[PDB]
Amino acid sequence: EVSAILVLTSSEASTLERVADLVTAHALYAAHDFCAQAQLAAAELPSRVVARLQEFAWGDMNEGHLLIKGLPQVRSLPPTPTSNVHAVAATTPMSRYQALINECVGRMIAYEAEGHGHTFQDMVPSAMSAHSQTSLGSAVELELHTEQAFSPLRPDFVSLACLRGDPRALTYLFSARQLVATLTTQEIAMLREPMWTTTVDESFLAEGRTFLLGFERGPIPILSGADDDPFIVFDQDLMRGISAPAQELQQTVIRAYYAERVSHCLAPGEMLLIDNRRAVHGRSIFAPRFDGADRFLSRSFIVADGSRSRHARSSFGRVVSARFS
Numbered sequence: 001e002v003s004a005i006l007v008l009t010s011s012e013a014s015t016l017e018r019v020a021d022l023v024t025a026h027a028l029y030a031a032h033d034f035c036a037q038a039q040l041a042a043a044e045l046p047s048r049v050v051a052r053l054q055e056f057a058w059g060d061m062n063e064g065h066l067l068i069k070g071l072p073q074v075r076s077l078p079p080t081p082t083s084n085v086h087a088v089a090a091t092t093p094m095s096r097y098q099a100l101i102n103e104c105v106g107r108m109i110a111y112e113a114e115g116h117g118h119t120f121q122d123m124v125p126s127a128m129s130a131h132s133q134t135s136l137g138s139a140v141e142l143e144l145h146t147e148q149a150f151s152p153l154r155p156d157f158v159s160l161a162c163l164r165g166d167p168r169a170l171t172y173l174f175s176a177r178q179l180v181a182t183l184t185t186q187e188i189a190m191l192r193e194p195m196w197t198t199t200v201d202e203s204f205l206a207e208g209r210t211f212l213l214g215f216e217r218g219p220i221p222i223l224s225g226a227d228d229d230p231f232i233v234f235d236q237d238l239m240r241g242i243s244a245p246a247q248e249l250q251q252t253v254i255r256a257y258y259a260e261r262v263s264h265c266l267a268p269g270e271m272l273l274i275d276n277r278r279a280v281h282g283r284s285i286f287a288p289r290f291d292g293a294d295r296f297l298s299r300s301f302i303v304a305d306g307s308r309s310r311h312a313r314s315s316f317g318r319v320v321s322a323r324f325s
């Protein structure tokens with residue numbers, strides 16, 4: 001179903017592998033140095049690969065995502081962790097490859113309130129949150145959403161590198177362009193109106209944690225930007241329409257998603273970049289075993305402009321403090 005594909009040749013994958021040796025800082029404990037090294041080393045990547053990533057980053061008429069195949073094979077991978085607190089992905093060779101590609105596109109960033117501000121988060125199924133609307137769910141379908149729909153500091157891109165796949169775990173992608181193509185002129189105009197409130201994801205709450213922007217935000221529109229290249233903010237589960245027509249238009253978006261969404265089953269060596277302004281994403285049900293061989297993705301976030309979050313970070317810091325989300 002996915003169209004926007006970059007297939008690395010054996011020679012390009014070998015170059016990536018060699019260029020990763022230039023990235024030596026600890027991804028977790030020296031995140032800024034690690035990301036800055038990746039940004040500099042990315043100049044040594046194959047020009048064909050860099051051109052495709054810069055074109056995708058510019059964004060104009062991009063498909064809302066880019067699937068990269070042919071990354072260097074995942075060797076001596078540790079068992080899939082049963083929880084996300086181990087940050088196992090952040091010390092694998094796959095994370096330096098992911099950093100190099102990410103830093104072509106934009107600046108890597110992390111959030112104190114999302115997976116403890118780890119540079120790379122382990123996206124692994126949770127036994128506890130299996131039936132939850134989170135990255136660690138599995139027994140229920142992860143509903144269509146913009147990453148951090150509630151936050152003005154939300155990432156510009158979501159980066160997912162596959163360490164272990166699950167054949168039943170499908171990633172669903174649906175662009176703002178695909179949505180607008182199914183709607184009437186009236187629905188598009190209403191989606192551009194500030195008719196939906198949104199709340200801070202439960203997972204972002206903590207004892208003594210107050211957000212500068214509160215728990216409930218908005219009303220905001222779902223659609224914005226250029227008529228021919230619209231931006232989307234959506235959260236099926238969290239956004240609430242202010243009126244009866246606003247609740248129905250949210251249902252219209254959901255139906256268009258089920259009818260038009262594209263799917264892809266992430267496999268080892270693959271990497272998916274999602275344009276968080278141009279597309280929404282979801283994930284199918286799958287049945288994890290919690291035996292060390294479960295689906296395991298390395299998630300990271302990208303912003304075009306690191307200055308937008310400077311008020312929320314420390315000097316030479318890559319982590320957005322919780323209260324600013």
Ligand SMILES: NCCC[C@@H](O)[C@H](N)C(=O)O
Pocket residue numbers: 133134135136145147148201203235237238
């Ligand atoms: N209801 C929205 C859930 C969205 C999900 O991607 C969340 N940001 C997570 O990683 O747990």
Ligand SMILES: [Fe+3]
Pocket residue numbers: 135145146147281
């Ligand atoms: Fe997500």
